Amino acid sequence: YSGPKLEDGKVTISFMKELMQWYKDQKKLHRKCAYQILVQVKEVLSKLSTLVETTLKETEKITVCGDTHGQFYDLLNIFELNGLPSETNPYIFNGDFVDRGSFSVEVILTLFGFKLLYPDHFHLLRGNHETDNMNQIYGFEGEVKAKYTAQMYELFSEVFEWLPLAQCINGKVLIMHGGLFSEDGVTLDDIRKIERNRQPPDSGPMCDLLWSDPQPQNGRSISKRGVSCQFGPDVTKAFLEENNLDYIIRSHEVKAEGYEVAHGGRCVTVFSAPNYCDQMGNKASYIHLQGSDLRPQFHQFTAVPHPNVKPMAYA
Ligand SMILES: C[C@]1(C(=O)O)[C@@H]2CC[C@@H](O2)[C@@]1(C)C(=O)O
Ligand SMILES: [Zn+2]
Ligand SMILES: [Zn+2]
C-alpha cells in the first residue's frame, strides 16, 4: 500500500491533499485509515449539540453547500472554485453527502477528513440520506460493501447518527437539510434538546428537519414524499418571529439554477450537485455569508467530467 497515511494517527493538510488526489485517480484509502477517520470523527461529532451555534465576526465569511450526493469530482470543483476549507475559509455542508452518486465513499471520507482537520470551521449537518433505510436502497450501503465490508458500513451508519441536525449562524440564520416543522411552536431550544443519535422517527421534529419542503401557499400539506409536510410562508414567518431569526437556508430539492429564494426571502434552497445523476442538467450553487452582512450571495457552478461509472451503480 503506497497511498495516503495519517501522521501520528491524525489528519493533516498534507494527508488531505494526498487523499483528494488518490481519490481523483480512483484509488482506495486503506481500510485501516478509513477506520481511524470514522472512529475519530464519531468522537468529535458525539460531543456536538444537535443545534450547532456559530458566531461569525464581522471580518469572517462562511460557505454553505447543499446536497452533493457522491459527486466527488464536483466536490473537488467546489474546492477549486472557492478554495480549500481552512480556519479562514469555513464550510457548512448541508446533508445528503452520499447515495445516488457513485463516488459516495470518496465524498464522505473527504468531508470527514476535513471535519477532523478543521473541527471548528468545517461543519456537517445530517441529511435524509445519512440514514440506514436510505443507504440500503440508494447506493451507499452497496458502495461501502463493494469497497470495504458490511462491517465498515455499520461503522458509517453509527457515525451518521451523531451528525448534528441544524446550525444557527449569529442567532440569525438557521440552516437544516429539509426544513421546518409539522407543528407550530418549535423553538431553537427544542432542537438543541433532540436526542439525535438514532435513525429518525417516522414523525416529529427530527423527521421534519431532515425531510420537509416549503410550498408557496399558506398552511401545511401532507408531503408527497410520504413523510413530514410541506410548509407555507406563514409557517416560516411564525417560526422566524418566535425564534428571532432572519431566514432559513435549507437544501433537499434539485433546482435548475442551483438555488431558490422562497417565502419572500425567508426560505432559501441551496443545491450543490450539478447535472444531478448525470441527467438533470441543472446548475448547482453555494452560498457565501459574511459576519458584517448575513444576506446570501449565490455562486453558481456547473458539472465537471468524471470517470465512467453510472449513478446508482451500487444501488
Ligand atoms: C432526490 C434527492 C434525494 O434523494 O436526496 C436528491 C435530488 C434532490 C434532493 O437531492 C432530494 C429530493 C433529497 O430528498 O435529498
Ligand atoms: Zn438529496
Ligand atoms: Zn434530502
mmCIF file of C-alpha atoms and ligand atoms in Angstrom:
data_model
loop_
_atom_site.group_PDB
_atom_site.id
_atom_site.type_symbol
_atom_site.label_atom_id
_atom_site.label_comp_id
_atom_site.label_asym_id
_atom_site.label_seq_id
_atom_site.Cartn_x
_atom_site.Cartn_y
_atom_site.Cartn_z
ATOM 1 C CA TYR A 1 0.000 0.000 0.000
ATOM 2 C CA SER A 2 1.514 3.263 -1.188
ATOM 3 C CA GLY A 3 -1.460 5.571 -0.558
ATOM 4 C CA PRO A 4 -2.300 8.344 1.964
ATOM 5 C CA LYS A 5 -1.428 7.592 5.617
ATOM 6 C CA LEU A 6 -2.276 9.579 8.752
ATOM 7 C CA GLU A 7 0.608 11.300 10.563
ATOM 8 C CA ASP A 8 0.889 10.108 14.138
ATOM 9 C CA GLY A 9 -2.610 8.752 13.670
ATOM 10 C CA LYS A 10 -4.148 12.120 12.812
ATOM 11 C CA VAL A 11 -5.344 14.018 9.752
ATOM 12 C CA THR A 12 -3.121 16.839 8.395
ATOM 13 C CA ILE A 13 -3.453 19.155 5.399
ATOM 14 C CA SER A 14 -0.779 17.181 3.551
ATOM 15 C CA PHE A 15 -2.817 13.988 4.099
ATOM 16 C CA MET A 16 -5.978 15.664 2.818
ATOM 17 C CA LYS A 17 -4.188 16.814 -0.331
ATOM 18 C CA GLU A 18 -2.810 13.332 -0.923
ATOM 19 C CA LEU A 19 -6.273 11.837 -0.307
ATOM 20 C CA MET A 20 -8.044 14.098 -2.814
ATOM 21 C CA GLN A 21 -5.522 13.172 -5.483
ATOM 22 C CA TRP A 22 -5.657 9.429 -4.593
ATOM 23 C CA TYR A 23 -9.412 9.618 -4.934
ATOM 24 C CA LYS A 24 -9.346 11.705 -8.145
ATOM 25 C CA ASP A 25 -7.270 8.846 -9.574
ATOM 26 C CA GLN A 26 -9.906 6.326 -8.464
ATOM 27 C CA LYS A 27 -7.821 4.708 -5.714
ATOM 28 C CA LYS A 28 -8.973 3.422 -2.303
ATOM 29 C CA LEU A 29 -7.934 4.610 1.118
ATOM 30 C CA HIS A 30 -6.585 1.754 3.210
ATOM 31 C CA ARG A 31 -9.363 0.249 5.348
ATOM 32 C CA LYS A 32 -7.251 0.958 8.443
ATOM 33 C CA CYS A 33 -7.017 4.691 7.677
ATOM 34 C CA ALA A 34 -10.756 4.820 6.835
ATOM 35 C CA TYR A 35 -11.466 3.116 10.137
ATOM 36 C CA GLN A 36 -9.289 5.616 12.042
ATOM 37 C CA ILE A 37 -11.085 8.567 10.484
ATOM 38 C CA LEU A 38 -14.511 7.060 11.264
ATOM 39 C CA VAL A 39 -13.715 6.391 14.934
ATOM 40 C CA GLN A 40 -12.141 9.804 15.417
ATOM 41 C CA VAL A 41 -14.906 11.779 13.700
ATOM 42 C CA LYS A 42 -17.563 9.861 15.709
ATOM 43 C CA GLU A 43 -15.892 11.143 18.849
ATOM 44 C CA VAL A 44 -15.838 14.689 17.567
ATOM 45 C CA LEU A 45 -19.425 14.628 16.350
ATOM 46 C CA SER A 46 -20.794 12.953 19.507
ATOM 47 C CA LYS A 47 -19.665 15.967 21.539
ATOM 48 C CA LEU A 48 -21.636 18.497 19.464
ATOM 49 C CA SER A 49 -25.073 19.891 20.251
ATOM 50 C CA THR A 50 -27.883 18.862 17.948
ATOM 51 C CA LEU A 51 -28.051 22.601 17.155
ATOM 52 C CA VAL A 52 -24.521 23.864 16.282
ATOM 53 C CA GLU A 53 -24.325 27.565 17.189
ATOM 54 C CA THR A 54 -21.661 29.543 15.292
ATOM 55 C CA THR A 55 -20.624 33.181 15.552
ATOM 56 C CA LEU A 56 -19.179 34.885 12.503
ATOM 57 C CA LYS A 57 -17.166 38.004 13.359
ATOM 58 C CA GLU A 58 -17.574 40.946 11.056
ATOM 59 C CA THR A 59 -14.422 40.117 9.055
ATOM 60 C CA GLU A 60 -15.336 36.412 8.674
ATOM 61 C CA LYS A 61 -17.130 34.520 5.959
ATOM 62 C CA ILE A 62 -18.617 31.057 5.626
ATOM 63 C CA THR A 63 -19.610 28.962 2.600
ATOM 64 C CA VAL A 64 -22.851 26.897 2.689
ATOM 65 C CA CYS A 65 -23.259 23.992 0.256
ATOM 66 C CA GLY A 66 -26.348 21.788 -0.192
ATOM 67 C CA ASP A 67 -26.635 18.189 -1.365
ATOM 68 C CA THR A 68 -23.545 16.620 -3.011
ATOM 69 C CA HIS A 69 -24.761 13.021 -3.391
ATOM 70 C CA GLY A 70 -21.498 11.235 -4.013
ATOM 71 C CA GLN A 71 -20.477 13.597 -6.864
ATOM 72 C CA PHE A 72 -16.814 13.632 -5.768
ATOM 73 C CA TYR A 73 -15.480 15.328 -8.919
ATOM 74 C CA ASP A 74 -17.938 18.191 -8.452
ATOM 75 C CA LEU A 75 -16.872 18.365 -4.800
ATOM 76 C CA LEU A 76 -13.273 18.854 -5.995
ATOM 77 C CA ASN A 77 -14.554 21.564 -8.311
ATOM 78 C CA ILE A 78 -16.222 23.432 -5.394
ATOM 79 C CA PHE A 79 -12.833 23.432 -3.565
ATOM 80 C CA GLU A 80 -11.046 24.687 -6.693
ATOM 81 C CA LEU A 81 -13.577 27.424 -7.300
ATOM 82 C CA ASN A 82 -13.928 28.521 -3.694
ATOM 83 C CA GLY A 83 -10.678 27.420 -2.092
ATOM 84 C CA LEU A 84 -9.822 24.587 0.295
ATOM 85 C CA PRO A 85 -11.522 24.608 3.696
ATOM 86 C CA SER A 86 -9.387 26.342 6.331
ATOM 87 C CA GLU A 87 -9.729 28.385 9.535
ATOM 88 C CA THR A 88 -10.264 31.374 7.255
ATOM 89 C CA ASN A 89 -12.404 29.593 4.679
ATOM 90 C CA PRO A 90 -15.070 27.697 6.688
ATOM 91 C CA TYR A 91 -17.666 25.441 5.114
ATOM 92 C CA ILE A 92 -21.069 24.030 6.018
ATOM 93 C CA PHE A 93 -22.233 21.020 4.008
ATOM 94 C CA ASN A 94 -25.993 20.698 4.465
ATOM 95 C CA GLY A 95 -26.676 16.965 4.304
ATOM 96 C CA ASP A 96 -27.070 14.330 1.630
ATOM 97 C CA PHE A 97 -23.330 13.665 1.043
ATOM 98 C CA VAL A 98 -23.969 10.089 -0.094
ATOM 99 C CA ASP A 99 -26.327 7.991 -2.231
ATOM 100 C CA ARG A 100 -27.295 8.406 -5.910
ATOM 101 C CA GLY A 101 -23.754 9.428 -6.966
ATOM 102 C CA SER A 102 -21.271 6.607 -7.383
ATOM 103 C CA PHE A 103 -18.317 8.242 -5.543
ATOM 104 C CA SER A 104 -20.107 8.434 -2.206
ATOM 105 C CA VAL A 105 -17.251 6.798 -0.320
ATOM 106 C CA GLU A 106 -14.826 9.427 -1.691
ATOM 107 C CA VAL A 107 -17.115 12.339 -0.807
ATOM 108 C CA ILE A 108 -17.825 11.188 2.748
ATOM 109 C CA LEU A 109 -14.225 10.307 3.734
ATOM 110 C CA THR A 110 -13.021 13.607 2.213
ATOM 111 C CA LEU A 111 -15.680 15.513 4.197
ATOM 112 C CA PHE A 112 -14.882 13.557 7.380
ATOM 113 C CA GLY A 113 -11.147 14.203 6.888
ATOM 114 C CA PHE A 114 -11.758 17.959 6.753
ATOM 115 C CA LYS A 115 -14.106 17.851 9.776
ATOM 116 C CA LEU A 116 -11.232 16.250 11.674
ATOM 117 C CA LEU A 117 -8.696 18.799 10.338
ATOM 118 C CA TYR A 118 -10.774 21.942 10.969
ATOM 119 C CA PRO A 119 -13.334 20.868 13.580
ATOM 120 C CA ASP A 120 -14.372 24.430 14.406
ATOM 121 C CA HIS A 121 -14.505 25.645 10.775
ATOM 122 C CA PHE A 122 -15.855 22.686 8.865
ATOM 123 C CA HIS A 123 -19.418 21.730 9.550
ATOM 124 C CA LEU A 124 -21.505 18.741 8.522
ATOM 125 C CA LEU A 125 -25.263 18.565 9.058
ATOM 126 C CA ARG A 126 -27.283 15.383 8.628
ATOM 127 C CA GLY A 127 -29.477 14.890 5.554
ATOM 128 C CA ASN A 128 -32.290 12.366 4.938
ATOM 129 C CA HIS A 129 -29.723 10.198 3.130
ATOM 130 C CA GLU A 130 -27.375 9.914 6.152
ATOM 131 C CA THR A 131 -29.659 7.119 7.378
ATOM 132 C CA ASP A 132 -29.856 3.305 7.067
ATOM 133 C CA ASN A 133 -33.167 2.935 5.189
ATOM 134 C CA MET A 134 -31.974 5.262 2.557
ATOM 135 C CA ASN A 135 -28.429 3.894 2.192
ATOM 136 C CA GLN A 136 -29.694 0.344 1.821
ATOM 137 C CA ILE A 137 -31.666 1.404 -1.282
ATOM 138 C CA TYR A 138 -29.867 4.332 -2.959
ATOM 139 C CA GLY A 139 -26.308 3.041 -3.301
ATOM 140 C CA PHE A 140 -24.185 3.979 -0.317
ATOM 141 C CA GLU A 141 -24.504 0.643 1.516
ATOM 142 C CA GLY A 142 -23.783 -1.147 -1.790
ATOM 143 C CA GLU A 143 -20.787 1.073 -2.454
ATOM 144 C CA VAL A 144 -19.314 0.560 1.036
ATOM 145 C CA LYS A 145 -19.815 -3.233 0.822
ATOM 146 C CA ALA A 146 -18.067 -3.238 -2.578
ATOM 147 C CA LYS A 147 -15.076 -1.133 -1.483
ATOM 148 C CA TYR A 148 -14.798 -2.262 2.144
ATOM 149 C CA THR A 149 -17.120 -4.538 4.193
ATOM 150 C CA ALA A 150 -20.578 -4.763 5.797
ATOM 151 C CA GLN A 151 -18.637 -4.033 8.957
ATOM 152 C CA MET A 152 -17.294 -0.721 7.549
ATOM 153 C CA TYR A 153 -20.842 0.150 6.530
ATOM 154 C CA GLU A 154 -22.138 -0.418 10.107
ATOM 155 C CA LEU A 155 -19.492 1.958 11.338
ATOM 156 C CA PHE A 156 -20.564 4.655 8.812
ATOM 157 C CA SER A 157 -24.178 4.235 9.995
ATOM 158 C CA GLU A 158 -23.139 4.791 13.607
ATOM 159 C CA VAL A 159 -21.163 7.928 12.763
ATOM 160 C CA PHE A 160 -24.078 9.375 10.731
ATOM 161 C CA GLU A 161 -26.299 9.148 13.854
ATOM 162 C CA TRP A 162 -24.060 11.706 15.532
ATOM 163 C CA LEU A 163 -24.287 14.360 12.756
ATOM 164 C CA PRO A 164 -25.957 17.484 14.136
ATOM 165 C CA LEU A 165 -29.406 18.363 12.655
ATOM 166 C CA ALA A 166 -29.183 22.178 12.333
ATOM 167 C CA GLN A 167 -26.824 25.148 12.565
ATOM 168 C CA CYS A 168 -27.568 28.685 13.598
ATOM 169 C CA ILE A 169 -25.194 31.499 12.499
ATOM 170 C CA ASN A 170 -25.156 34.641 14.707
ATOM 171 C CA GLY A 171 -28.599 33.816 16.143
ATOM 172 C CA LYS A 172 -29.956 34.961 12.766
ATOM 173 C CA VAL A 173 -29.711 32.324 10.023
ATOM 174 C CA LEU A 174 -30.856 28.757 10.724
ATOM 175 C CA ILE A 175 -29.625 26.012 8.380
ATOM 176 C CA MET A 176 -31.111 22.493 8.104
ATOM 177 C CA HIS A 177 -31.239 19.934 5.334
ATOM 178 C CA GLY A 178 -35.036 19.550 4.940
ATOM 179 C CA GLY A 179 -36.933 22.414 6.562
ATOM 180 C CA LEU A 180 -39.367 23.473 9.260
ATOM 181 C CA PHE A 181 -41.997 21.655 11.261
ATOM 182 C CA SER A 182 -45.324 19.856 11.007
ATOM 183 C CA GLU A 183 -46.419 21.670 14.208
ATOM 184 C CA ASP A 184 -46.212 25.306 15.299
ATOM 185 C CA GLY A 185 -44.258 26.382 18.307
ATOM 186 C CA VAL A 186 -40.936 24.583 17.813
ATOM 187 C CA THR A 187 -38.034 26.576 19.271
ATOM 188 C CA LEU A 188 -34.261 26.609 18.885
ATOM 189 C CA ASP A 189 -34.063 25.128 22.384
ATOM 190 C CA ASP A 190 -36.333 22.236 21.308
ATOM 191 C CA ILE A 191 -33.861 21.500 18.522
ATOM 192 C CA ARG A 192 -30.946 21.670 20.946
ATOM 193 C CA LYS A 193 -32.737 19.033 23.084
ATOM 194 C CA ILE A 194 -33.439 16.474 20.314
ATOM 195 C CA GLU A 195 -31.766 13.179 21.184
ATOM 196 C CA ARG A 196 -30.405 12.715 17.740
ATOM 197 C CA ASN A 197 -28.254 9.587 17.959
ATOM 198 C CA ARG A 198 -30.694 7.236 16.241
ATOM 199 C CA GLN A 199 -32.404 6.598 12.934
ATOM 200 C CA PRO A 200 -35.022 9.339 12.567
ATOM 201 C CA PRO A 201 -38.634 8.670 13.724
ATOM 202 C CA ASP A 202 -41.464 8.467 11.124
ATOM 203 C CA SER A 203 -42.785 11.745 12.554
ATOM 204 C CA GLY A 204 -41.824 14.633 14.748
ATOM 205 C CA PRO A 205 -39.232 17.360 14.645
ATOM 206 C CA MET A 206 -36.176 15.207 13.957
ATOM 207 C CA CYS A 207 -38.093 13.800 10.944
ATOM 208 C CA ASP A 208 -39.157 17.302 9.796
ATOM 209 C CA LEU A 209 -35.627 18.781 9.973
ATOM 210 C CA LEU A 210 -34.449 16.095 7.501
ATOM 211 C CA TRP A 211 -37.497 15.748 5.298
ATOM 212 C CA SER A 212 -39.890 18.730 4.967
ATOM 213 C CA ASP A 213 -40.217 21.066 1.921
ATOM 214 C CA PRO A 214 -41.501 24.659 1.577
ATOM 215 C CA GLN A 215 -44.709 25.225 -0.507
ATOM 216 C CA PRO A 216 -45.758 28.600 -1.982
ATOM 217 C CA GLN A 217 -49.201 28.713 -0.440
ATOM 218 C CA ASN A 218 -50.094 29.431 3.189
ATOM 219 C CA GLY A 219 -50.658 26.460 5.515
ATOM 220 C CA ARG A 220 -49.309 22.915 5.606
ATOM 221 C CA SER A 221 -49.794 19.982 3.334
ATOM 222 C CA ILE A 222 -49.212 16.244 3.608
ATOM 223 C CA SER A 223 -45.906 15.637 1.857
ATOM 224 C CA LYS A 224 -45.821 13.808 -1.498
ATOM 225 C CA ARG A 225 -42.698 12.074 -0.164
ATOM 226 C CA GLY A 226 -44.865 10.173 2.310
ATOM 227 C CA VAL A 227 -43.018 11.610 5.288
ATOM 228 C CA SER A 228 -43.236 15.042 7.033
ATOM 229 C CA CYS A 229 -45.046 18.025 5.464
ATOM 230 C CA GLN A 230 -44.859 20.905 3.036
ATOM 231 C CA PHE A 231 -44.926 24.262 4.917
ATOM 232 C CA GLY A 232 -46.129 27.679 3.714
ATOM 233 C CA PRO A 233 -44.796 31.176 4.027
ATOM 234 C CA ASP A 234 -46.974 31.670 7.093
ATOM 235 C CA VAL A 235 -45.269 28.766 8.848
ATOM 236 C CA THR A 236 -41.834 30.223 8.048
ATOM 237 C CA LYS A 237 -42.733 33.747 9.223
ATOM 238 C CA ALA A 238 -44.126 32.478 12.542
ATOM 239 C CA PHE A 239 -41.066 30.288 13.226
ATOM 240 C CA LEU A 240 -38.606 33.130 12.446
ATOM 241 C CA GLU A 241 -40.545 35.580 14.589
ATOM 242 C CA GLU A 242 -40.692 33.267 17.610
ATOM 243 C CA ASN A 243 -37.026 32.423 17.354
ATOM 244 C CA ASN A 244 -35.781 35.944 16.459
ATOM 245 C CA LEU A 245 -34.254 34.674 13.203
ATOM 246 C CA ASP A 246 -33.921 36.432 9.827
ATOM 247 C CA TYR A 247 -34.216 33.491 7.427
ATOM 248 C CA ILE A 248 -33.515 29.825 6.868
ATOM 249 C CA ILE A 249 -31.247 28.036 4.444
ATOM 250 C CA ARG A 250 -32.119 24.518 3.502
ATOM 251 C CA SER A 251 -31.396 22.126 0.682
ATOM 252 C CA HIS A 252 -33.111 18.733 -0.207
ATOM 253 C CA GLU A 253 -34.553 19.662 -3.650
ATOM 254 C CA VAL A 254 -32.923 19.954 -7.006
ATOM 255 C CA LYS A 255 -33.133 23.453 -8.512
ATOM 256 C CA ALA A 256 -32.396 24.252 -12.158
ATOM 257 C CA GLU A 257 -30.254 27.289 -11.249
ATOM 258 C CA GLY A 258 -28.751 25.730 -8.101
ATOM 259 C CA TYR A 259 -30.751 27.816 -5.654
ATOM 260 C CA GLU A 260 -34.142 29.324 -4.997
ATOM 261 C CA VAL A 261 -35.371 32.015 -2.639
ATOM 262 C CA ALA A 262 -38.931 31.405 -1.496
ATOM 263 C CA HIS A 263 -41.292 32.808 1.150
ATOM 264 C CA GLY A 264 -40.449 36.404 0.201
ATOM 265 C CA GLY A 265 -36.758 35.912 1.162
ATOM 266 C CA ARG A 266 -37.328 33.765 4.266
ATOM 267 C CA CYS A 267 -36.648 30.292 2.906
ATOM 268 C CA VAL A 268 -33.554 29.732 0.737
ATOM 269 C CA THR A 269 -32.758 26.461 -1.046
ATOM 270 C CA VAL A 270 -29.125 25.684 -1.947
ATOM 271 C CA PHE A 271 -28.306 22.585 -4.018
ATOM 272 C CA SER A 272 -24.664 21.633 -4.728
ATOM 273 C CA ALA A 273 -24.954 18.636 -7.084
ATOM 274 C CA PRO A 274 -24.714 19.989 -10.678
ATOM 275 C CA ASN A 275 -26.121 17.800 -13.537
ATOM 276 C CA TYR A 276 -27.584 15.639 -10.775
ATOM 277 C CA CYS A 277 -27.266 11.927 -11.563
ATOM 278 C CA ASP A 278 -25.679 12.768 -14.909
ATOM 279 C CA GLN A 279 -29.163 13.630 -16.098
ATOM 280 C CA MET A 280 -30.814 16.675 -14.502
ATOM 281 C CA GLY A 281 -28.782 19.275 -16.465
ATOM 282 C CA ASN A 282 -29.126 21.683 -13.522
ATOM 283 C CA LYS A 283 -26.628 24.249 -12.312
ATOM 284 C CA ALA A 284 -25.500 23.972 -8.693
ATOM 285 C CA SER A 285 -24.575 26.776 -6.198
ATOM 286 C CA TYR A 286 -23.001 27.522 -2.923
ATOM 287 C CA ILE A 287 -23.759 30.487 -0.706
ATOM 288 C CA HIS A 288 -21.409 32.975 0.886
ATOM 289 C CA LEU A 289 -22.360 34.715 4.142
ATOM 290 C CA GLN A 290 -20.271 37.360 5.975
ATOM 291 C CA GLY A 291 -20.342 38.454 9.587
ATOM 292 C CA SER A 292 -20.903 42.044 8.504
ATOM 293 C CA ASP A 293 -23.696 41.065 6.093
ATOM 294 C CA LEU A 294 -25.607 37.816 6.533
ATOM 295 C CA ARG A 295 -27.645 38.192 3.341
ATOM 296 C CA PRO A 296 -26.961 35.233 0.982
ATOM 297 C CA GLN A 297 -24.670 35.643 -2.004
ATOM 298 C CA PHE A 298 -25.079 32.868 -4.567
ATOM 299 C CA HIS A 299 -22.213 31.406 -6.589
ATOM 300 C CA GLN A 300 -23.297 29.135 -9.418
ATOM 301 C CA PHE A 301 -21.295 26.338 -10.943
ATOM 302 C CA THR A 302 -21.666 23.549 -13.482
ATOM 303 C CA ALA A 303 -20.766 19.818 -13.726
ATOM 304 C CA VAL A 304 -17.225 18.701 -14.495
ATOM 305 C CA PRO A 305 -16.088 15.404 -16.100
ATOM 306 C CA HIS A 306 -15.860 12.256 -14.005
ATOM 307 C CA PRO A 307 -14.801 8.655 -14.625
ATOM 308 C CA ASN A 308 -17.256 6.424 -16.460
ATOM 309 C CA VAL A 309 -19.224 4.943 -13.529
ATOM 310 C CA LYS A 310 -23.004 5.381 -13.779
ATOM 311 C CA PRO A 311 -25.070 6.861 -10.978
ATOM 312 C CA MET A 312 -26.631 4.290 -8.678
ATOM 313 C CA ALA A 313 -24.215 1.631 -9.993
ATOM 314 C CA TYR A 314 -24.080 0.181 -6.473
ATOM 315 C CA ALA A 315 -27.812 0.634 -5.752
HETATM 316 C C1 LIG B 1 -33.847 13.169 -4.701
HETATM 317 C C2 LIG B 1 -32.932 13.810 -3.653
HETATM 318 C C3 LIG B 1 -32.546 12.737 -2.635
HETATM 319 O O1 LIG B 1 -32.874 11.541 -2.840
HETATM 320 O O2 LIG B 1 -31.966 13.071 -1.588
HETATM 321 C C4 LIG B 1 -31.737 14.480 -4.346
HETATM 322 C C5 LIG B 1 -32.330 15.246 -5.518
HETATM 323 C C6 LIG B 1 -32.999 16.442 -4.825
HETATM 324 C C7 LIG B 1 -32.664 16.188 -3.363
HETATM 325 O O3 LIG B 1 -31.393 15.572 -3.515
HETATM 326 C C8 LIG B 1 -33.550 15.027 -2.923
HETATM 327 C C9 LIG B 1 -35.036 15.283 -3.209
HETATM 328 C C10 LIG B 1 -33.481 14.685 -1.470
HETATM 329 O O4 LIG B 1 -34.575 14.343 -0.950
HETATM 330 O O5 LIG B 1 -32.406 14.821 -0.806
HETATM 331 ZN ZN ZN B 2 -30.708 14.917 -1.621
HETATM 332 ZN ZN ZN B 3 -32.657 15.410 1.053
#
